[PDB]
Amino acid sequence: MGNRGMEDLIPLVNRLQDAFSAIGQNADLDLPQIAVVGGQSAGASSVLENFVGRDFLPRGSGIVTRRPLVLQLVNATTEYAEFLHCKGKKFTDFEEVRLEIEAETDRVTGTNKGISPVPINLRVYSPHVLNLTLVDLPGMTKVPVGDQPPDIEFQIRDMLMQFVTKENCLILAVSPANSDLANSDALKVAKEVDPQGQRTIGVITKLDLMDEGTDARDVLENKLLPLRRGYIGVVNRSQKDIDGKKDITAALAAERKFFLSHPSYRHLADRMGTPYLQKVLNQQLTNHIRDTLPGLRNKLQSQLLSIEKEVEEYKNFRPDDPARKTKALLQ
């Protein structure tokens, strides 16, 4: 468990925050939000919870991600979770969080394949995290089922747009492997909001369920559909493994064995897997935080130059100075 790529950046944020708080001002540390776009049952929730490093989201066959859960990670001194609709309660166990999320979804949408545009706001405080926004959006579908209205397709798409047309957002586009990449909706959306690939990261899931004799070797090499940041393959837990309470360590070991043994992927083994995605996102955040330094320097330099002309005289103030008095008199 855990995510150790945060540890090397947290003290940088703290030091910058302290440097600005010294003057009664904040730091414009506008880190990008992370939005996970995907088709229904593409695996977009298991990827997200593998980036956080905690097993707390509901996942599984069927329509589970019924509401647009928004997770806020706030750096703190201890570890706890809270909900805006459960104000005053404290959650010390992620299993309770998962069960409460399910109960809150059912309470509003019912037991059919319902949806609700209103998000759930879950905030987790921990000394090991950064101030991040994570958005788990409901998967897109083509036809209504259950008691959904005829426009279910358009309501879901509209829920996505308000979160991915915003600047400073990473579109983490998840598509299954045992399907044809040309028919992945997540990539159609990315091309509608990021016409040139600067933020979009491709992730290919379900590589272990490919039809025997076929592989995706020409997809992972960024040949079929060029994407500025390529595609990162991952292997998540299967439905049997979720129901079997499979450990996370075993899943990572199985993923590593899969890539090391597969005849068509050995040469890419060091470019794929869960920990590689963690490094890519952490590197993306680090590149962002460094890119803003010229603005902070220019603001501070301008303020310093503005005050210096008067500081030069204030620093020379003395309780007894007949020349200072005379200068003021003449002026």
Binding site: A19, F20, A22, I23, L304, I307, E308, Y314
Partner: peptide, 27 residues
């Protein structure tokens, strides 16, 4: 006037400290 002087000097030193920290953070 005394209060304005004191605030200007405090802000001056704090801004100098902020630059001395940011430059070291960038490395």
């Amino acid at each position: 006037q005394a209060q304005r002087r004191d605030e200007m000097l405090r802000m001056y030193h704090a801004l100098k400290e902020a630059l001395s920290i940011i430059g070291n953070i960038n490395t």
